[PDB]
């Protein structure tokens, strides 16, 4: 007769939603790693085969900056860091005054007061009766409070410090973030499609791909590469305010080595053997460094400036010569390698025709800190235990983190410096394609049919 | 052949209405694997839930999913459509909601843009849906007071 409403349960309808995701570890049990790896050993195993269902005809709007999956992952990484630091040994009594003197850099090395020889008039208990021990400290970890070569460890009057357990490992492993039932993860599979906007090509997944939580500051490491052309990501406004995200199509290789042959010393601090330290180096005194093929880095920088004038839209002077720093984490490429924390001078990579050329492979000097303040806000700092032997890690450089110096000078000024952006931007760099939605399966529509009969 | 979970999201409303069971299943087979706790039973007891609030946090996410299911089954219940996936009602279709004809709706539109076009009047339709039943409640009321 007339038109009547009819209830439909299970219609393909979704709305933008933020929900609680959970962790998932690859189903290897990571037996070849010897401890837990970001405490993600205890985490639901992935399905042997994931089901990815392509959605024909579907076009959905994405926003990697409004995704919040990034903020969730960020808090998850922070909390995991704290959960792994809580049970470990806190070095509260180790802030005693140190009598330290400078020791010579080698005649093959830049004469710097670096790696300081420090003696401890500190007593642990009455049993110790102010034992005198000596340890090797990188210059950055210590400050000269009073003259006559009197020293203390930095931070000790500001906050406590805790020692990373030697057993736990900082190696990032792939983590698939999964949504519960009734929610879904949407994945844009257009390779060239920029980070945000409507995606003509959408698939649905129960869990995302394997995302490695690589701690980095200047350049992104061990990420995933965009196919075909490299990708450049800013916000809508684009005018000296955001942080430029770069995703490369070809990875560059970077080898970082610490040649010093460290050892172990000053074991027992607390009841029982509780603390690791650096014995005297065996062999030559060489400073840490990283090489990057000068040819490949000049090619990659060229393709970068080509895509910069591409997204910019207007011919303009784009320089790299300068670089500016706040703190330490923006002047240096901060990252982690084997459990030691490296901080590298990138000025050779960010100058103007720096090559010639002058080296087969560009070399960057890197200093090392065992006291770091990544996610240690104001209160709890971490001491990375020393690593015995020589250190050497090979890393894929997949992305970059940049910042403009936009300035209405009629296209004259426009300078791009390697910012030391937050870690959340690293998560945005791999979450750009994913999005969380909630299913609203209830649709009502008229089909001019009525349930006359009741019961 | 079946397009898969949410496969007909870009199809016409009639085609998706044919595979609504497919979308109905992801409400249960996400939550069957988690309640199973078979692969969770032995791994470090109950996935070490002591000093790990992510474990509780994870659990709260599982709670939200079954809670949403209970919201939809409640709505199907109070509309007298619990057992069926497609049910017809007594509520007449007020034309102010949408003026589109039947052929244009079911063979030219997808459920997404339809839900977007009618999200404005969803609450009103639900009110008529909660109200209209009340006349069935009243007919049963006539049969009750004899």
């Amino acid at each position, epitope marked *: 007769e007339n038109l009547w409403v009819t209830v439909y349960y299970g219609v393909p309808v979704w709305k933008d939603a933020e929900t609680t995701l959970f962790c998932a570890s690859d189903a290897k049990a990571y037996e070849t790693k010897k401890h837990n790896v970001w405490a993600t050993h205890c985490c639901v195993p992935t399905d042997p085969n994931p089901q990815e269902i392509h959605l024909e005809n579907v076009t959905e709007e994405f926003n990697m900056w409004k995704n919040n999956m990034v903020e969730q992952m960020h808090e998850d990484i922070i909390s995991l860091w704290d959960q792994s630091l809580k049970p470990c040994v806190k070095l509260t009594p180790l802030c005693v005054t140190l009598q330290c003197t400078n020791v010579t850099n080698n005649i093959t090395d830049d004469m710097r007061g670096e790696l300081k020889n420090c003696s401890f008039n500190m007593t642990t208990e009455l049993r110790d009766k102010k034992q005198k021990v000596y340890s090797l400290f990188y210059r950055l970890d210590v400050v000269q409070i009073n003259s006559n070569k009197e020293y203390r460890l930095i931070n000790c009057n500001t906050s406590a410090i805790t020692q990373a357990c030697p057993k736990v490992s900082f190696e990032p492993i792939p983590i698939h973030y999964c949504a519960p039932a009734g929610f879904a993860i949407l994945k844009c599979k257009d390779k060239k499609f920029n980070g945000t906007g409507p995606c003509p090509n959408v698939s649905t997944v129960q869990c995302t791909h394997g995302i490695k939580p690589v701690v980095s500051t200047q350049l992104l490491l061990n990420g995933s590469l965009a196919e075909e052309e490299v990708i450049i990501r800013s916000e809508n406004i684009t005018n000296n305010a955001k942080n430029i995200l770069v995703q490369l199509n070809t990875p560059v290789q970077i080898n970082c080595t610490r040649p010093n042959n460290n050892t172990v010393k000053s074991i027992r601090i607390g009841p029982g053997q509780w603390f690791y330290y650096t014995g005297d180096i065996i062999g030559d005194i060489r400073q840490a460094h990283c090489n990057v093929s000068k040819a490949t880095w000049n090619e990659t920088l060229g393709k970068v400036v080509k895509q910069l004038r591409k997204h910019f839209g207007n011919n303009t002077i784009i320089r790299f010569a300068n670089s500016s720093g706040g703190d330490l984490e923006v002047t240096t490429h901060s990252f982690n390698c084997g459990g030691e924390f490296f901080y590298c001078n990138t000025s050779g990579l960010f100058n103007s025709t720096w090559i010639s050329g002058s080296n087969d492979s560009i070399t960057l000097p890197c200093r090392i800190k065992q006291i770091i303040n990544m996610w240690q806000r104001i209160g709890q700092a971490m001491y990375a235990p020393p690593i015995q032997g020589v250190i050497r890690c090979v890393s894929n450089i997949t992305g970059l983190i940049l910042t403009r110096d936009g300035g209405s000078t009629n296209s004259t000024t426009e300078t791009f410096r390697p910012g030391g952006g937050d870690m959340r931007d690293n998560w945005r760099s791999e979450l750009y394609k994913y999005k969380v939605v909630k299913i609203e399966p209830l649709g009502v529509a008229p089909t001019r049919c009525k349930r006359r009969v009741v019961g | 052949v079946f397009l898969g979970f949410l496969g007909a999201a870009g199809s016409t409303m009639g085609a998706a209405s044919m595979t609504l069971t497919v979308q109905a299943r992801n409400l249960l087979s996400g939550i069957v694997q988690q309640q199973s706790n078979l692969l969770r039973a032995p791994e470090c007891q109950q996935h070490l839930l002591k000093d790990t609030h992510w474990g509780i946090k994870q659990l709260q996410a599982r709670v939200l999913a079954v809670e949403h299911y209970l919201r939809d089954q409640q709505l199907l219940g109070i509309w007298g459509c619990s057992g069926k996936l497609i049910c017809c009602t007594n509520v007449p279709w007020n034309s102010s909601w949408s003026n589109r004809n039947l052929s244009e709706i079911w063979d030219n539109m997808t459920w997404l*843009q339809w839900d977007k076009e009618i999200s404005n009047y969803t609450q009103i339709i639900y009110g008529l849906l909660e109200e209209s039943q009340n006349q069935q409640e009243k007919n049963e009321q006539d049969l009750l007071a004899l």
Partner: nanobody
Amino acid sequence: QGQLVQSGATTTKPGSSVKISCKTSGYRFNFYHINWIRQTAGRGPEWMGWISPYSGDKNLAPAFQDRVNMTTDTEVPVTSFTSTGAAYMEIRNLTSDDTGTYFCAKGLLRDGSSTWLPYLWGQGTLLT
């Protein structure tokens, strides 16, 4: 809500091949078909053919079966339910009787019996 823009008109002497471009907007270009129709001056207008932007399947009238090549550019997404595309039409052998007005149109419904039926038309073009 959709719009169908058509290329500029041009007159070419018979014997050569030509190309008409019909640019779309205001809808999902892959959802509705694309029809090409001619209005003959002096006789009844005749439908020429249709092609799916998505499926790519093409079906032409026998009056233009081995004389017409159709192509559909991949749609460009705009909104969550709006895209833009380009439809191209070609003729192999030109003559004086080919003179007339031409139009490009979209489909009415996505499914059913009236799927490829022309609904929204372009402004039109004139020939030799």
